[PDB]
Amino acid sequence: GTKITFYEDKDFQGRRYDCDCDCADFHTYLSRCNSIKVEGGTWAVYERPNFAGYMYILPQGEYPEYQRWMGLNDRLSSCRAVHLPSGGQYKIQIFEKGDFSGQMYETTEDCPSIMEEFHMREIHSCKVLEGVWIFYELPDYRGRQYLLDKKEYRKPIDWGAASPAVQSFRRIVE
Ligand SMILES: [Mg+2]
Q1: For residue 140, how many other CB atoms are within 10 A of its CB?
Q2: How many whole angstroms from 111 Cα to the centroid of ligand 1?
Q3: Which of 2, 14, 98, 120 could join 124 via S-S bond, C-beta 3.0 to 4.6 A?
């Protein structure tokens, strides 16, 4: 089922790499990425090998420029398919402070503005109770993205963020 294609140049041109499973390192096959086709599944694609650096979530679709997936540069070199639980449930708890302290909020819905809904622009810890979610550094699902597909996150670095800025979040739905 799951299949993704990476191209070096815009508009599905240039050297190409295809992947139907996780790939921790494709840098030897491809030196840059400027377009992607996702034929099936939803994929997390990462700037550096072993799922490091900037990351981005792409559902099925055609992406003729990296700006189409909110890419931040022309570098990609690892990818993995997002596993959506068959049960189809989503619930997250967000916390004001690290280590699950401070004010907590629980939700099963998306949040395009944490400031509007919860009066925060940083989240310092999180429990993903059900499902798979994405945190964004900017409002309304803009900017750098962080995949939350583990259960517990005691500090922002646990979701890959050097910054505590989180201004929106949403679920990855099938
Ligand atoms: Mg709302």
Answers
A1: 12
A2: 5
A3: 98
96 Cα–ligand 1 center, Å: 19
104: CA distance to ligand 1 center in Å?
Answer: 17
Question: Resolution (in Å) of the shown entry?
Answer: 1.3
What spatial distance separates the first Cα and last Cα of the chain, rounded to whole Å?
13
Residue 55 CA, chain-centre distance (Å), reads: 5
Helices vs strands, H then E, count in the chain: 1, 14
- Residue 116's H or E segment, with its range, is helix 114-118
Give the distance (Å) from ligand 1 centre to CA of residue 168.
10
Give me ligand 1 centre to Cα 117, in Å. 7
| 4: DSSP letter | E
The CA distances from residue 80 to 6, 12, 27, 84, 150, in Å, are: 13, 20, 15, 12, 14
How was it solved? X-ray
Ligand 1 center to residue 109 CA distance, Å?
A: 7
